[PDB]
């Protein structure tokens, strides 16, 4: 198969700690504001060994395409220039992002019918829960 338990269109159901997460990420007040207006739909899709996550909103349409284990450059939603590496372990996708000597983790896994994304920075954890569209 491949990475097939993540594939689909996902819609945000509940967010918690995300603004505080971005405070720890070092994101400025104005950007934190815009970032918390948007409640994007996450759209996942896999071709061969390349996975794609498309956060698609009115304000911003981002899209990362990654080979898995291979380092790629990313511009994050909040306007960071990052180097990311994505790993699959224990049924979970672990994305690490590094920039200006800093590192954060975005772990995406299934619970049951839902997909949970946790972002972690210096012991602030954000938790967003998506369900299927």
């Amino acid at each position: 198969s491949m990475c097939d338990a993540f594939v689909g269109t996902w819609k945000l159901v509940s967010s918690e700690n995300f603004d505080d997460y971005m405070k720890e990420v070092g994101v400025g007040f104005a950007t934190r504001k815009v970032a918390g207006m948007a409640k994007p739909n996450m759209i996942i899709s896999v071709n061969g060994d390349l996975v794609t996550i498309r956060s698609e909103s009115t304000f911003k349409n981002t899209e990362i395409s990654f080979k898995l284990g291979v380092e790629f450059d990313e511009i994050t939603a909040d306007d960071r220039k990052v180097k990311s590496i994505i790993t699959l372990d224990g049924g979970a996708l672990v994305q690490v992002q590094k920039w200006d000597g800093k590192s954060t983790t975005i772990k995406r896994k299934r619970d049951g019918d839902k997909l949970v994304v946790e972002c972690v920075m210096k012991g602030v954890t954000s938790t967003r829960v998506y369900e299927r569209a």
């Epitope: 405070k23 070092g26 400025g28 007040f29 104005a30 950007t31 304000f59 994050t76 200006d100």
Partner: antibody, heavy 119, light 109 residues
Framework: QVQLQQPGAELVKPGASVKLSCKAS????????ITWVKQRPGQGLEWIGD????????TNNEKFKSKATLTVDTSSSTAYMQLSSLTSEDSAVYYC????????????WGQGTTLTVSS | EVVLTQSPALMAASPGEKVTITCSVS???????LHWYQQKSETSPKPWIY???NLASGVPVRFSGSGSGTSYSLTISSMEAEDAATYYC?????????FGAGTKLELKR
């Protein structure tokens, strides 16, 4: 290139109102916050507000609540700040600037518009 | 409100000389949201250093920026005549957005 255009100078009588412009170009307009800064002669820099073109949502200084009101027209690619109930205290240079996301610093600035309120 | 206090309000330096301004904060900010601008002759101020230490496009290499918790600073390694100007730090980690009052840098003679 990235550029915000403001008229050079404006003359308005006391008690009247005035609406100032910041015309943008060289980048996608709705992707960046636009801020307004007031500077009087001799004195330093004063922040009025931010507006997000594309949403029109604002962040504002509590010191300028009555005075200033921020809006945009995306069709024109313009930002506007309206001042009202004008006094001599409003004679200053007004800078609009494009804000740069994460970090949130002002990378591009319009020349000021020198507002003069006088009889 | 995060109050930014900038030390020497007024400063004179002769070409060649090392120069340090401080921007000192009343409470904690994220180093990524502390910025310096340089203004000449009250025309449009210019971005100089962003995120404490980054340094804007076309800003010379003699300039650098530093920071830590209580204080941030701007340093010129060697003064040039064109560096005489008024330099404001500014903060956007927390509402409201604040400025410091500036330090004017004049040429010493």
């Amino acid at each position: 290139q990235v550029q915000l255009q403001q008229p050079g100078a404006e003359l308005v009588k006391p008690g009247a109102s005035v609406k100032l412009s910041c015309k943008a170009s060289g980048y996608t307009f709705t992707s960046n916050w636009i801020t307004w800064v007031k500077q009087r002669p001799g004195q330093g820099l004063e922040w009025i507000g931010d507006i997000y073109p594309g949403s029109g949502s604002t962040t504002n200084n509590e010191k300028f609540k009555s005075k200033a009101t921020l809006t945009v027209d995306t069709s024109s690619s313009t930002a506007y700040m309206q001042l009202s109930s004008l006094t001599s205290e409003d004679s200053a240079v007004y800078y609009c600037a494009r804000l740069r996301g994460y970090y949130d610093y002002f990378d591009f600035w319009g020349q000021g518009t020198t507002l003069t309120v006088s009889s | 409100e995060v109050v930014l206090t900038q030390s020497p309000a007024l400063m004179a330096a002769s070409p060649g000389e090392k120069v340090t301004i401080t921007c000192s904060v009343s409470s904690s900010i994220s180093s990524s949201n502390l910025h310096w601008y340089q203004q000449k002759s009250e025309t449009s101020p210019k971005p100089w250093i962003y995120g404490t230490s980054n340094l804007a496009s076309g800003v010379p290499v003699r300039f650098s920026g530093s920071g830590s918790g209580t204080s941030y600073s701007l340093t010129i390694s060697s003064m040039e005549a064109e560096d005489a100007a008024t330099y404001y730090c500014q903060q956007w980690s927390h509402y409201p957005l604040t400025f410091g009052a500036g330090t004017k840098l004049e040429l010493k003679r």
